[PDB]
Write an enzyme that holds these catalytic residues in place. Structure first.
Site, PDB file in Angstrom:
ATOM      1  N   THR A  68       2.581-107.759  29.382  1.00 49.60           N
ATOM      2  CA  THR A  68       3.418-106.693  29.922  1.00 49.60           C
ATOM      3  C   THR A  68       4.384-106.105  28.884  1.00 49.60           C
ATOM      4  OG1 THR A  68       5.054-108.284  30.699  1.00 49.60           O
ATOM      5  CG2 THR A  68       3.354-107.661  32.273  1.00 49.60           C
ATOM      6  N   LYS A  69       4.504-106.728  27.706  1.00 53.14           N
ATOM      7  CA  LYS A  69       5.552-106.381  26.755  1.00 53.14           C
ATOM      8  C   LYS A  69       5.145-105.190  25.888  1.00 53.14           C
ATOM      9  CE  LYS A  69       8.482-108.817  28.413  1.00 53.14           C
ATOM     10  NZ  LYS A  69       8.134-110.222  28.706  1.00 53.14           N
TER      11      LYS A  69
END
Lengths: 421, 417
Positions: B189-190
């Site tokens: 998700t980063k």
């Protein structure tokens, strides 16, 4: 004919020494790529498959075998002020797992032949603070689980099996990991059922224990199939999640486990049969009513057999290591000292200010006896790691046996090298 | 056109809504495959990351949480110590002290920046304080002038939680490199993702790096030269990063600034449209910083809709409903300040109240700004991270403009049971 340590031809040719482990097939690569492009959960698939294959009620996949142990301790209510009995001969992770959950590890000596924690010594190290025992199935050999569980029941202790080195092993026909309250497996790349990196599995028959571990591995949150993450945490947790890629890889490995296992059992049996004929060489054994996984092969060497009375076992250990390595057998040590000698357990600083030892007031010198069996085993033993795990290592192990037989055909030189060292 | 919620066409057609993240290319697939069959990828990523962002040392670890806890350990923070952290944060920031047997102390956040307010940090310091973990929350660098000044005035360590802000700068300095150490989280998700889990600890201090290096691997010293002897030099964990994940992140990092350029253009154009809407506060970079735009948090003023004196949560809910009907995936990020989480309320910890037992913190509602921010804010996550999301964000802006063209209907929903 002549020793390779002194210019002779090696019993193992150089071009035949390399062994790839893990054994990566195209099915493994595809599984990994499929998991990458499938961003239908590989982790829960592995959990189901592991539980199914080995007959466990519950399986929780985590980051490492160490995390499996620490999360199990937490789930079983072990923490500050509690002592956990572990073997003095072990991988350090077994001794650290208690510390990670702010409990104090207590080291029991091992058996001279099985190398596993001696139940009699376990009993001697129980105190009012003891809360758990972590028996290790060291090197792949199941520990004395009848005695350990009996002790645990008598003193109201938890039992967590460290089965990191013993996948597929059995105790009275029962899969290791399912006998204690919980069982921990490691899926590191060096292991008998590897992953491409790191991984761990916690197994248990207890649903509540499993749920605790499931929450603990993900910050105390409950993560559901297709519900939005609300970040609500229900207790103390960590990030001890397993990677999906690594899970998919291990699932692929499992499809060949039975075949690889058959080959290992056959190959190791034939290897040890030849070495067992050599005087002063004690091959590793499964205890009665158990099966060994043969993760690591540890051999003890008796100086008496080379007429080396009154010379240190370490001198023979060194001599044999030098000679066997020259022939192309990668003989090693596994652990140079019992865990009690490790700085972390000697200094007892821990997280700082002596914790976790400060809670119990065990900051001063270690309570109880030394560990002479662990020390003796280390003094006179060498190990083979990795090479024997590959299903096609039959010919290599044949050459290894050639090398051992060759070294034993030169007892005068062994004694000379040992006499000097 | 009419609101989707009342039968009109959604501003965002369904075939436009899905965004792939991470963005996986053939180079990523090859890097992973090469890692399987094989310059170790972990070491390579450490060097690459340090090189890009100008750090003296980079130590790859299992997770961003481990990076934080190992940093605390390296800085001598442990039993009896307090660590000041923000009251609005991902829980990992508050847990990292606990994991190292220290006590987290929560400071309130700024109403605009959402970062820990130095005015409140100053109040929270005690004789037990040993460190501060500023978070660059949502991608916005914290007030590092005042956080570092406070720390140096009081003899405290600073560890940056830069998980949400890779590539962001403060006074032209890459975040992570300003404190004693900096932690990054790599997840799917980063902003710079890995295919799974990962963490990086950066520092200018060689001894601190060595401490973390040992701590991630059972206290051992690993080498290319010598055989593994299993000698441990102190308390360690298994906090190793996986090689496959490292290789993947290396590939992602080579494309990072290309993606940054698109992302930054796209978000700026999006926020410029929303900034024109009354009672909508777009997120901003503070002075002398840039924003990584990991998460976009918007605050909404009830007064703009004539809802003065009505709970802001009512407007929040109405806007969320109307916007999601248009196809905009508006979310919350954190439902409560970290102090309200059971772990921090109960203070049981490992058991028997540790770590709190050591500090004497075995014994009201606090942090009003964190609560106010949660009460009136919604977030966009993920979709704006993709370099091709420009048109999507314009569709989102269309949706916001539609909703804002119907204030009476917003008010009616907010005021309804």
């Amino acid at each position: 004919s002549k020793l390779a340590a002194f210019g002779g031809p090696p019993a193992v040719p150089r071009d035949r020494r390399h062994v790839e482990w893990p054994l990566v097939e195209d099915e493994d690569r595809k599984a990994v790529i499929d998991a990458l492009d499938g961003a239908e959960n590989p982790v829960s698939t592995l959990e189901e498959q592991w539980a199914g294959r080995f007959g466990f009620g519950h399986c929780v996949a985590v980051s490492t075998g160490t995390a499996a142990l620490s999360l199990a301790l937490a789930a079983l209510g072990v923490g500050p002020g509690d002592e956990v009995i572990v073997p003095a001969l072990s991988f350090i992770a077994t001794g650290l797992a208690p510390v990670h959950q702010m409990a104090v590890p207590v080291f029991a000596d091992v058996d001279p032949v099985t190398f596993n924690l001696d139940p009699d010594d376990v009993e001697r190290r129980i105190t009012g603070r003891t809360a758990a025992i972590i028996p290790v199935h060291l090197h792949g050999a199941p520990a004395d689980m009848d005695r350990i569980t009996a002790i645990a029941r008598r003193h109201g202790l938890a039992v967590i099996e460290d089965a990191a080195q013993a996948p597929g092993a059995t105790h009275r026909g029962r899969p290791v990991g399912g006998i204690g309250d919980a069982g921990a497996f490691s899926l590191q790349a060096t292991k008998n059922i590897p992953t491409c990196g790191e991984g761990g599995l916690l197994v248990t028959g207890n649903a509540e224990l499993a749920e605790s571990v499931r929450r603990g591995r993900q910050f105390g949150e409950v993560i559901e199939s297709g519900r939005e993450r609300d970040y609500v945490s229900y207790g103390l947790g960590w990030n001890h999640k397993m990677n999906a890629l690594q899970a998919a890889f291990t699932s692929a490995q499992l499809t060949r486990f039975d075949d690889y296992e058959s080959a290992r059992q056959r190959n190791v049996a034939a290897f040890l049969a030849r070495l067992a004929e050599l005087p002063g060489l004690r091959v590793p054994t499964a205890a009665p009513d158990t099966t060994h996984a043969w993760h690591i092969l540890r051999f003890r060497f008796d100086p008496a057999a080379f007429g080396l009375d009154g010379v240190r076992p370490q001198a023979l250990r060194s001599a044999l290591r030098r000679l066997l390595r020259a022939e192309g057998v990668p003989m090693s040590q596994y652990q140079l000292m019992p865990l009690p000698d490790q700085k972390v357990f000697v200094d007892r600083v821990g997280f700082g200010g002596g914790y976790p030892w400060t809670v119990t007031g065990a900051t001063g010198p270690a309570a109880g006896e030394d560990h002479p069996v662990a020390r003796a085993v280390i003094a006179d033993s060498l190990t083979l790691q990795k090479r024997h795990l590959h299903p096609e290592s039959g010919e290599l192990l044949h050459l290894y046996a050639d090398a051992f037989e060759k070294v034993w055909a030169n007892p005068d030189m062994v004694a000379t090298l040992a006499g000097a060292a």
